Amino acid sequence: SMSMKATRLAIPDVILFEPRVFGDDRGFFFESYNQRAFEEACGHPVSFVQDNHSRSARGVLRGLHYQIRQAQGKLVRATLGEVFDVAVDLRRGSPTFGQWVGERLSAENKRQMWIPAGFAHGFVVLSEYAEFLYKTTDFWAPEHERCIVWNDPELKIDWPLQDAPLLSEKDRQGKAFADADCFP
Amino acid sequence: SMSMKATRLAIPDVILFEPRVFGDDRGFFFESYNQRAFEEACGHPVSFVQDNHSRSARGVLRGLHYQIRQAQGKLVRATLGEVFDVAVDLRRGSPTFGQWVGERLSAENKRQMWIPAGFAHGFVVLSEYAEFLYKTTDFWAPEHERCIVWNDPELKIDWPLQDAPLLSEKDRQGKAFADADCFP
Ligand SMILES: Cc1cn([C@H]2C[C@H](O)[C@@H](COP(=O)(O)OP(=O)(O)O[C@H]3O[C@@H](C)C(=O)[C@@H](O)[C@H]3O)O2)c(=O)[nH]c1=O
Numbered sequence: 001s002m003s004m005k006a007t008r009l010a011i012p013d014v015i016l017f018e019p020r021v022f023g024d025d026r027g028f029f030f031e032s033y034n035q036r037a038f039e040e041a042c043g044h045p046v047s048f049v050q051d052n053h054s055r056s057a058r059g060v061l062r063g064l065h066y067q068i069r070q071a072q073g074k075l076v077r078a079t080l081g082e083v084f085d086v087a088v089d090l091r092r093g094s095p096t097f098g099q100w101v102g103e104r105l106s107a108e109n110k111r112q113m114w115i116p117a118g119f120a121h122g123f124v125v126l127s128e129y130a131e132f133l134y135k136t137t138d139f140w141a142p143e144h145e146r147c148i149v150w151n152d153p154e155l156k157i158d159w160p161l162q163d164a165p166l167l168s169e170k171d172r173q174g175k176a177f178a179d180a181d182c183f184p
Numbered sequence: 185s186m187s188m189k190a191t192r193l194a195i196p197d198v199i200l201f202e203p204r205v206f207g208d209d210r211g212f213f214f215e216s217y218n219q220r221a222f223e224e225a226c227g228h229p230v231s232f233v234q235d236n237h238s239r240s241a242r243g244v245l246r247g248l249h250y251q252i253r254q255a256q257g258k259l260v261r262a263t264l265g266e267v268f269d270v271a272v273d274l275r276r277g278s279p280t281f282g283q284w285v286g287e288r289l290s291a292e293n294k295r296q297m298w299i300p301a302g303f304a305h306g307f308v309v310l311s312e313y314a315e316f317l318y319k320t321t322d323f324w325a326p327e328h329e330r331c332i333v334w335n336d337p338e339l340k341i342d343w344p345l346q347d348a349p350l351l352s353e354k355d356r357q358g359k360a361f362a363d364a365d366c367f368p
Pocket residue numbers: 052054062063065066074121122123140168170206213214215
């Protein structure tokens with residue numbers, strides 16, 4: 001009896017989870033998600049309808065993404081390698097509007113971040129490759145997808161990069177925070 | 185055009201899924217699960233409440249597992265390495281009671297097996313290591329867990345294994361199919 005750990009971040013609706021891992025002669029086992037435990041920690045019901053999996057090379061940066069309608073809460077983790085994962089509060093009425101939190105998530109540390117609807121999300125790959133898995137509370141709606149550019153000068157996100165990031169065209173063309181659609 | 189594929193196996197309630205993978209110069213993206221797409225293929229609504237993650241060395245065999253109350257449907261895949269994954273029908277009244285189907289699931293082939301409640305499940309690891317992920321329709325209930333021994337001589341599972349498998353103590357002590365608690 002050790003157990004799952006949940007820790008609210010500086011933007012308290014963002015939660016850092018750490019599973020309890022059971023090792024034995026075969027390798028290991030852990031629960032990567034448990035609805036009862038998760039809901040207890042969050043303080044409200046959450047339902048996931050899609051799971052996504054990406055593989056990215058060192059220096060790849062994906063984000064900052066959100067859906068302005070059909071907004072998605074995201075529970076994210078790394079199953080290979082290491083990333084720095086960032087959540088940006090885009091709720092206009094929030095006292096932390098325009099602030100961000102970031103944590104290193106890796107296959108080894110098994111940490112996860114819960115990033116509710118109303119946030120933008122992104123990550124950068126620190127390892128040779130990283131595989132990133134996340135669960136979403138609503139479906140992909142490309143018509144509603146929005147992007148804020150990684151290096152926005154108002155957000156001032158400290159990405160641990162040693163070189164220019166490798167971006168998709170969509171992400172390279174992200175809007176400035178000042179011009180971005182935000183949530184109430 | 186390409187999209188997710190679903191194929192019913194010889195025991196038709198067991199479904200083999202293969203996601204559509206989008207490659208680009210960052211790596212790839214795929215939806216590992218989509219509730220709409222899944223429910224359409226299966227023909228009935230589903231709710232998953234727990235996700236499990238295990239890591240196992242070559243020759244590790246886990247199974248054959250089921251819960252006789254709080255029975256779990258399982259949607260399983262490999263995110264590292266390769267396994268041979270087996271589903272055994274333990275519904276006494278089923279036309280396929282005592283039959284099994286098996287498929288190789290790997291990180292590279294991205295194949296998944298949907299194994300309904302009423303089945304036993306196991307896998308053997310073919311690669312140096314494998315990481316095996318699965319979603320379950322009900323919670324872990326150790327009081328209700330049962331195991332049938334991997335090499336039961338009535339099931340006659342053709343495990344593509346050269347040498348003796350590495351088993352947990354529990355799995356070494358699995359019951360004979362002839363003596364096992366089964367579902368109606
Ligand atoms: C996001 C997504 C993409 N796709 C397809 C569209 C395209 O062909 C390919 C790649 O899409 P993208 O370039 O938009 O994928 P990507 O840049 O990996 O987008 C993701 O980034 C992380 C950080 C998030 O927060 C996610 O919500 C999502 O925005 O996958 C889906 O089929 N379903 C999905 O849910």
